[PDB]
Design a protein around this ligand. Structure first.
Ligand SMILES: Cc1ncc(COP(=O)(O)O)c(CN[C@@H](C)C(=O)CCCCCC(=O)O)c1O
Ligand SMILES: [Mg+2]
Length: 383
């Protein structure tokens, strides 16, 4: 019965210490975390360039409310398509070298709407095995067939694309992977994708704004233009939302068939003004300064881990993992760090694969070398 169904499931999660509870925070983004009116250095957020508290971004969010009120009033297919929404999309499309952009309320929504609109039961989705849960979930629910290729294995991907297919195939991967921080062999991936008349879909949540010239992300940097690029704004951009970069025809296609775009309220125009300002910083000289400082900090942290008995879970991005060599995967070293002012976190399956529960540390440009020195200090010891 319903409650038995509920209760059992909850019981199974308990049994693996797979149980998640939220902790309420006063501040969760950027240099500092504030919890229980207790300040910690924050190594758990996704605010990679420290824009969540940029004065200009804050101001565009406030002024926009002054100008546009809050709610958009409806769907972009009725009276909810603001000129500010339009401008943001044009600016995004201009920035990344695409003909069109389409705003979504979230990255999760964008990925699922694309995969749902475009894939049919005859089709195939070849996705990296560590692709984000919104992609895999959706490809899973899709009536299309889903095949995963081993992480970054272009050989394997080739084998899956080569397999006789009744319909079309979509390759999907990430620019900067969620949990490991590594990148995908994009030029190599796109060439086998192309060889099989595939289309490539790249999710650059974790690279967008943070690498490449003008922070244009993983695809620009690597000289690849996937037919679909998803960019999401709740990380480096410091806000919320997402967009789908694509051609004019695919764009038109997505406007007809992507329910999340048709049957969902558009974002408040003021949120969109905030995103445009964020884009401005990211493409600005301040944008470069922030990217370079983040790189400086990564270097610093990474060199520091050399004198340490841990996993330098080879990452050049703001994401620096640490697999679990023991931890009521839930916590420690995690707590030790926490008690010492370094707010860190334990990431466990199903989010992570296997005996792979971990410390997913993230650096940001809001941090300072003395913050990193401390996290180094505390991983090393001191008290
Ligand atoms: C690669 C990637 N793509 C898309 C999205 C979704 O975009 P959105 O945030 O705008 O909807 C994210 C989210 N990454 C973050 C938000 C997570 O997936 C958090 C996972 C936390 C796991 C917690 C646990 O395992 O206990 C992302 O990591
Ligand atoms: Mg994620």
């Amino acid at each position: 019965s319903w409650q038995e169904k509920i209760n059992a499931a909850l019981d199974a999660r308990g049994a693996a210490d797979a149980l998640r509870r939220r902790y309420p925070v006063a501040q969760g983004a950027g240099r500092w975390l504030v919890a229980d009116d207790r300040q910690y250095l924050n190594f758990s957020s996704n605010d990679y360039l420290g824009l969540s508290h940029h004065p200009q971004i804050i101001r565009a969010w406030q002024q926009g409310a002054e100008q546009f009120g809050i709610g958009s009033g409806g769907s972009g297919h009725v009276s909810g398509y603001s000129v500010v929404h339009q401008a943001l999309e044009e600016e995004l499309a201009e920035w990344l070298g695409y003909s069109r952009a389409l705003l979504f309320i979230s990255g999760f929504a964008a990925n699922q709407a694309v995969i749902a609109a475009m894939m049919a039961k005859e089709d195939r989705i070849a996705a990296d095995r560590l692709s984000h849960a919104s992609l895999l979930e959706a490809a899973s629910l899709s009536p299309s067939q889903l095949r995963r290729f081993a992480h970054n294995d272009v050989t394997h991907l080739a084998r899956l694309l080569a397999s006789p297919c009744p319909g079309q195939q979509m390759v999907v991967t990430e620019g900067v992977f969620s949990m490991d921080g590594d990148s995908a062999p994009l030029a190599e991936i796109q060439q086998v994708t192309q060889q099989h008349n595939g289309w490539l879909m790249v999710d650059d949540a974790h690279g967008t704004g943070v690498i490449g010239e003008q922070g244009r992300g993983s695809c620009w940097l690597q000289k690849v233009k996937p037919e679909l690029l998803v960019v999401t704004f709740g990380k480096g951009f410091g806000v919320s939302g997402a967009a789908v970069l694509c051609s004019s025809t695919v764009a038109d296609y997505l406007l007809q068939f992507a329910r999340h775009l048709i049957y969902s309220t558009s974002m408040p125009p003021a949120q969109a003004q905030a995103l445009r300002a964020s884009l401005a910083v990211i493409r600005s000289d301040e944008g470069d300064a922030r990217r370079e400082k983040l790189a400086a900090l990564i270097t610093r942290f990474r060199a520091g881990v050399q004198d340490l008995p841990f996993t330098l879970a080879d990452s050049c991005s703001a994401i620096q993992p640490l697999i679990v060599g023991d931890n009521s995967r839930a916590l420690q070293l995690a707590e030790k760090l926490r008690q010492q002012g370094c707010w860190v976190t334990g990431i466990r399956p199903p989010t992570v694969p296997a005996g792979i529960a971990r410390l997913r540390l993230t650096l940001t440009a809001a941090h300072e070398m003395q913050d990193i020195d401390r996290l180094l200090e505390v991983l090393h010891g001191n008290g």
